[PDB]
C-alpha cells in the first residue's frame, strides 16, 4: 500500500504487465489443457440401467450412485489419496464435470466400442 514505492516502481516500466501477462497465459493454458484432455466428446453417454455385459464387472470404474460426488470407487480413492497479492483462480472445469466427462467416455467405450470416437 506504499504510494512512494509504487511511484518508484513506475520508473522501471512495464515489468509488472509482462509478469501478469505471463501468469495469465499460464492460467488460460491450464484450462486449454484440461479441455484438450477431457473434452473430446460432445455427447454425454450413459450406461444402461441393467449391467449385463456378459460377465464383465465395471462397478469399480463406473460412477457410484450412493456417492454425492458421482465418482467411481477408484476415482474416489484417487481423490482421497491426493492431498500478499497472491490469488488462486479456480479451474474452469470442476471435479464433478470432469468426472462426468470420464463417465461419458466410459459409457461410450463400454456400450459402443471405438465407434463413438469416429462418429455416431
Amino acid at each position: 500500500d506504499s504510494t512512494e514505492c509504487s511511484n518508484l516502481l513506475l520508473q522501471y516500466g512495464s515489468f509488472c504487465t509482462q509478469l501478469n501477462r505471463a501468469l495469465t497465459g499460464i492460467a488460460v493454458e491450464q484450462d486449454k489443457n484440461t479441455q484438450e484432455v477431457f473434452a473430446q466428446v460432445k455427447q454425454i453417454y450413459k450406461t444402461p440401467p441393467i449391467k449385463d455385459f456378459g460377465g464383465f464387472n465395471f462397478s469399480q470404474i463406473l460412477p457410484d450412485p450412493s456417492k454425492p460426488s458421482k465418482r467411481s470407487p477408484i476415482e474416489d480413492l484417487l481423490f482421497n489419496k491426493v492431498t500478499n497479492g497472491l490469488t488462486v483462480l479456480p479451474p474452469l472445469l470442476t471435479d464433478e464435470m470432469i468426472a462426468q466427462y470420464t463417465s461419458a467416455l466410459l459409457a461410450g467405450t463400454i456400450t459402443s466400442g471405438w465407434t463413438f470416437g469416429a462418429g455416431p
Binding site: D1, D31, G85, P90, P91, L93
Partner: protein, 162 residues
C-alpha cells in the same frame, strides 16, 4: 477494457482490467490509544506492530507469554490486545482481480464485472465460487460455454446471462 487493451474495438471474452483493494476505513492504535474496531478493514498498530487487516474474534488458545501469532508464511494472523487480554484473528483485507466480461463492441456495449475471490457483501448480483459477478443475470438453463467465468460458470449474450 479499451484502455487496457489499447484498442477501440474489444473482441468477445473476459479481460483482466484492474485490481480491487478494500481501502482501510479507520486506523486503530492499541498501546499498554484508540478504540478497538472489529469486523472492518482497518489499519492496526499493536505494540508497535503495524499492519492492515480485518479484526475478528479468535478461538485460538494463546499461552500467557505468547502475544502475536504467525502462520506458515510468518505473517501475523492472530494478535492479543495488550489492554484486554483477548485474541483476534487478522484476516487480510479483501483484494482481487477485476475482470470485464463483454461481447464484441460490434455486437453490444453491455458489460459485466467479475471481482475474483471477493464475496458480494464487501463490494444483478450473483455469487460464484470464482467471485462476485455484477451486471449479469443468473439463469437456471444450461448452454454451451461462450465466455468462461470459472468454477463451471460461463457467460453469454442473448442482456448478458450467466
Amino acid at each position: 477494457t479499451k484502455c487496457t487493451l489499447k484498442s477501440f474495438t474489444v473482441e468477445k471474452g473476459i479481460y483482466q482490467t484492474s485490481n480491487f483493494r478494500v481501502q482501510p476505513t479507520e486506523s486503530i492504535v492499541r498501546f499498554p490509544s484508540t478504540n478497538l474496531v472489529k469486523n472492518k478493514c482497518v489499519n492496526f498498530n499493536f505494540n508497535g506492530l503495524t499492519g492492515t487487516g480485518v479484526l475478528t474474534e479468535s478461538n485460538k488458545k494463546f499461552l500467557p507469554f505468547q502475544q502475536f501469532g504467525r502462520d506458515i508464511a510468518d505473517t501475523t494472523d492472530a494478535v492479543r490486545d495488550p489492554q484486554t487480554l483477548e485474541i483476534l484473528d487478522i484476516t487480510p483485507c479483501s483484494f482481487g482481480g477485476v475482470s470485464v466480461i463483454t461481447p464484441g463492441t460490434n455486437t453490444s456495449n453491455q458489460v459485466a464485472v467479475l471481482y475474483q475471490g471477493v464475496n458480494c457483501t464487501e463490494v444483478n448480483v450473483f455469487q460464484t465460487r470464482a467471485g462476485c459477478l455484477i451486471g449479469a443475470e443468473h439463469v437456471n438453463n444450461s448452454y454451451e460455454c461462450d465466455i468462461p467465468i470459472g468454477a463451471g460458470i460461463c457467460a453469454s449474450y442473448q442482456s448478458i446471462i450467466a
